[PDB]
Amino acid sequence: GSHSMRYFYTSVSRPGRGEPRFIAVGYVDDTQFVRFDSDAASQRMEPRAPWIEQEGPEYWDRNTRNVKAQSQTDRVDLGTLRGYYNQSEAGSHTIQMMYGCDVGSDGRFLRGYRQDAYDGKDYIALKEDLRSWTAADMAAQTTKHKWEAAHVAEQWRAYLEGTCVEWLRRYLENGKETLQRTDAPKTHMTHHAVSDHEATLRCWALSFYPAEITLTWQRDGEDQTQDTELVETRPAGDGTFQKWVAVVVPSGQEQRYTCHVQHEGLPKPLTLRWE
């Protein structure tokens, strides 16, 4: 369908000695494909999907250089922000950033993003126009004026519309056997008595990709939300995802209840009932 590339960076300061812990992860859609961890011995960007391994030495050097530079920038920023906010040297603090691009099924640019946070709260973000900045507070406002003077948004726009989209298209082609394959959910229903007169019906979706899914209960053909429980979508650990939704019902009335499953991999939604 449409596709995304996203990078997620986290720095966590280490009061008392040395540099922050820096972690970077890259995704295409919901597939991790690279990582960098400052705690790891390689000090290199490392592959996490088979289809990235073919990239040559220059790719790995360049990508390593980029994230190392960002880790240093984060270190500096952690210090200057601590100063701005008059915070002690004692506490650990964090900077996070997410950036990336979305492309349509024709491979054309749809949208770009570049947003960051300090201590888990919005700091500065590029707006959807890729021209303007959203600054959450007066430190970020200071940053905004600095980056306006330095043409930073222009650089980011050119990255997001250019490099980002070009490389995303490349990955989608190189990794097409998995990246452009949808794995529809494998579904089933379980039944768990909660007394001698009521039971939980749990509707399972397993082994699906991508992670986006909708699970709903209906009773007598209309959605029911009362007396239901919907768990957060969770990773299986093999690249696929899991979710379930449950409902408590009077025993003997199970045939009234139907579970409905919507996913990109299902041309029509699926309906399950208890046998």
Partner: peptide, 10 residues
């Protein structure tokens, strides 16, 4: 492919 853009905030 990562961004090469790494300007400081303050």
């Amino acid at each position: 492919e990562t961004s090469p853009l790494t300007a400081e905030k303050l």
